[PDB]
Amino acid sequence: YLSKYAIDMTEQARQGKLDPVIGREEEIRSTIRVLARRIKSNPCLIGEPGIGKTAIIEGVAQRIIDDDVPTILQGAKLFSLDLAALTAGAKYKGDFEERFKGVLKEIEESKTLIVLFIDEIHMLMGNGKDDAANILKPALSRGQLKVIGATTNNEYRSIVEKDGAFERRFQKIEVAEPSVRQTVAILRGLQPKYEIHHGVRILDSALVTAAQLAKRYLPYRRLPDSALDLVDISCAGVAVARDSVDSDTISETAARLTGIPVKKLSESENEKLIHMERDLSSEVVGQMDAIKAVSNAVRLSRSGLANPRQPASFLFLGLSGSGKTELAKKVAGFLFNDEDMMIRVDCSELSEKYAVSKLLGTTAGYVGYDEGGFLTNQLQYKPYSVLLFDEVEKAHPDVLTVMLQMLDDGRITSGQGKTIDCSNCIVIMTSALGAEFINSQQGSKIQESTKNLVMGAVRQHFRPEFLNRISSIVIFNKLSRKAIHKIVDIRLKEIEERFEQNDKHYKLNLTQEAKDFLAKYGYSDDMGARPLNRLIQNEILNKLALRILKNEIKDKETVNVVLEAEECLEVLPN
C-alpha cells in the first residue's frame, strides 16, 4: 500500500501549493530535537482540535523542504496513510492491520531519513490499545523510521500515555492558544495569498478587530476560524454586493452571536464600564451608593491588581428593593449584555454543611448524577455568569468554604477539577435576615446604627472569611414613596415590545392617581411588590380582550381613566 490514504505532501511543499502559515516554531524546534532523539524519541503536541497542530507539522515541512536546517534527518517520509483505512482497508475483517501491513513493505526499510506523522495518537492506534495500527510499535519505530500522532489531552490519551507502548515514548509539547499580537502578523501574513485568493483588497485596522474580539469573548471559536470565516464572511457581502469595510463583516457576525454587535461593538471596557455604571444609574436609581458600591470593583474587575482571579464583587446585603437581585443580574448581563448569567441554587437540600447533594455533589467517580449541575455545566455552558444566594443560606458550609476558596481568591475549587476560570465572574452573596431591623426605616433614608449591628449580628453569624474580604455593599431604603413609580413606564414599555410593539401601539396612559392607587395599595409595605404587573395588566387586559372583542377602535391611546372603596376601577373606553 502506497499513496492511497497517504497525505503526499512534502512535494506539495516541494512544489509548494501549500500556503505557509508560520506559527510557534519552538515546539517544532523542540520537535526538531527529535531527529536523533532516542530515549523518548519525540514529544507530542496537545491543542484543542482547530489549531493547526499539524499545520505546524505542515509548517514543519516548510521548515523541512526549505532545508538549510538539520539534514541529520534529510530524506523524507512525512505522509499520513491512515485515514479511515482502519475499517476502510477491504470488504471484510482482519485487513486493517494488513491495511497497515500492506503499508509496511511499501513503507519498508527507510532510505528517507524523515519520520512521518499521523494525526492523533488516537487517530494513531485506531481506537487505541487495538491491533489496529500495529498496536505494538518498537519494531518499526525502533526499526525503519517513526511516525507521530497528536490529540487533545487526558483520559483516552492519558490511559495509553501512562504505559502501553508510550511507556518509553513521546512527551507532549503544546502550543498555546494563538497569542496576542502575531495573530494579525498571522492574519496579515494570512492576508496576501489567503486574502489575495479571497477577494477585493484590504487595509489593517479592521484586521485588528475580531482578532481582539475572537480573542475576546469567544472561547469557543477563539481561533481565527471566525476571522477566517470573517475573511470569507467579508467577501461574502461585498463581492456579492459588487456583483450586480468597517469590520462590519464582523458586525453581522457579532450580530449573529451577540444578537446585535452594538451590544458587542459597544462600550469598550473601562470608562464604558463606568458609562455602563452611569447607564445602570440610567437603569435604576435608589441608593447611588448602592450603584456606587456596586460601581466599586467594576473598574477593579478585569483590570486586576493581584490577579483577575480576584473575585471583585460587591458583597450583597440580602433584600429586594428594585434592581435588587434582578437588575443585579441585569447589570451582570449589562456587563456582558447577556441576561442569562447564572441560575439560583435552592439551598433547601443543602441544609447541612454536607450532602451528596452539593453544587458539586458527586465526584463523578461512582454511580449517580452530578449535583449542582450548574457549575458542572454552567461553565461548560458559559463564562462570567451571575450567582445565586439566599438570605438564610441553607447551603452546605462545605461548598461555601470550598467556595470560600473561590470566595476570597479567583479560581474556584472545581469538584471535578477544572476552574476553567474565574476571570469575569464577579458576583455577590445575597443574604440578610434582619427584616424587622430592616424594618427600621423612616423618611426616605436610614441612618446607620442598626445597619451596623444585625450586620454585626450577621457579621459573626456564619464565620468571618465569608464576611472577611470582598468589600462592597447593598443598601435598602426601598422607594420612599413615588420614586419607584417610574418603573411603570418601564412596566409599560415592558409591554409592547415583548411580542411586537406592532400589536398595540396604543400605549395608553397611566393616571398617576391610579398608579398611586395602584402602587400605594398594590405593592406591600413589606414587598407585595410583584403583582400589580400581574394584576393591573388584567383588568386592563380585559379591555384589551374587550376592546379586542367587539372591536370598535384602533389607535394609540391614553387611558388615564378611573372612578370596599378599595377600587375606583380604572378601565378605558373607545
Ligand X SMILES: Nc1ncnc2c1ncn2[C@@H]1O[C@H](COP(=O)(O)OP(=O)(O)OP(O)(O)=S)[C@@H](O)[C@H]1O
181 contact, one of its own copies, ligand X, none, CB 5-8 Å limit per kind = none
322 contact, one of its own copies, ligand X, none, CB 5-8 Å limit per kind = ligand X
323: annotated binding-site residue? yes
Of 31-39, 402-410, 417-425, 490-498, the segment contacting its own copies by CB under 8 A is 31-39
53: annotated binding-site residue? yes
Residue numbers 274-293 binding ligand X by CB under 6 A:
284
- Give the Cα separation of 4 and 85 in Å (integer): 9
Q: Does 565 bind its own copies (CB under 8 A)?
A: yes
Residue (of 430, 537, 544) closest to 488 by Cα position: 537
Q: How far is CA 104 from CA 63, 122, 151, in A?
A: 27, 20, 24
Among 330, 538, 546, 562, binds its own copies (CB under 8 A): 538
- The DSSP secondary-structure symbol of 15 reads I
- Collapsing DSSP states into helix, strand and coil, what is residue 541? helix
Q: Does 467 bind its own copies (CB under 8 A)?
A: yes
417: annotated binding-site residue? no
CA 121 to chain centre: 29
Which residues are CB-neighbours of 119 under 8 A, at least 6 positions away? Answer: 54, 80, 82, 149, 150
Q: Does 186 bind ligand X (CB under 6 A)?
A: yes
Report the 10 Å Cβ neighbour count for 301.
23
- Give the Cα separation of 404 and 413 in Å (integer): 9
Q: Does 306 bind its own copies (CB under 8 A)?
A: no
> C-alpha angle with apex 495: 489 to 498, nearest 5 degrees?
135
* Shortest spacing between CB 515 and its own copies, in angstroms: 20
Q: Does 324 bind ligand X (CB under 6 A)?
A: yes
326 contact, one of ligand X, its own copies, none, CB 5-8 Å limit per kind = ligand X
Under 8 Å between Cβ of 360 and 416 = yes
59 contact, one of its own copies, ligand X, none, CB 5-8 Å limit per kind = ligand X
Under 8 Å between Cβ of 170 and 41 = yes
- Give the Cα separation of 359 and 280 in Å (integer): 31
Q: Does 14 bind its own copies (CB under 8 A)?
A: no
* Shortest spacing between CB 478 and ligand X, in angstroms: 8
318: annotated binding-site residue? yes
50: annotated binding-site residue? yes
> What residue type is assigned to position 232 of the chain?
D
Of 148-156, 201-209, 398-406, 563-571, the segment contacting its own copies by CB under 8 A is 563-571
Among 27, 28, 42, 47, binds ligand X (CB under 6 A): 47
Residue (of 13, 7, 12) closest to 66 by Cα position: 13
Among 37, 122, 292, 507, binds its own copies (CB under 8 A): 37
Q: Does 173 bind ligand X (CB under 6 A)?
A: no
* Secondary structure of 370-428 as H, E, C letters: ECCHHHHHHHHHCCCCCCCCCCCCCCCHHHHHHHHHHHHCCCCCCCCCCCCCCCCCCCC
Q: Does 126 bind ligand X (CB under 6 A)?
A: no
Among 1, 7, 9, 23, binds ligand X (CB under 6 A): 23
Residues lying near its own copies in the complex (CB under 8 A) are found at: 32-39, 70, 72-73, 109, 138-139, 142-143, 168, 467-468, 471-472, 524, 526-527, 530-531, 534, 538, 564-566
Binding-site annotation: residue ranges for ATP:
47-54, 318-325
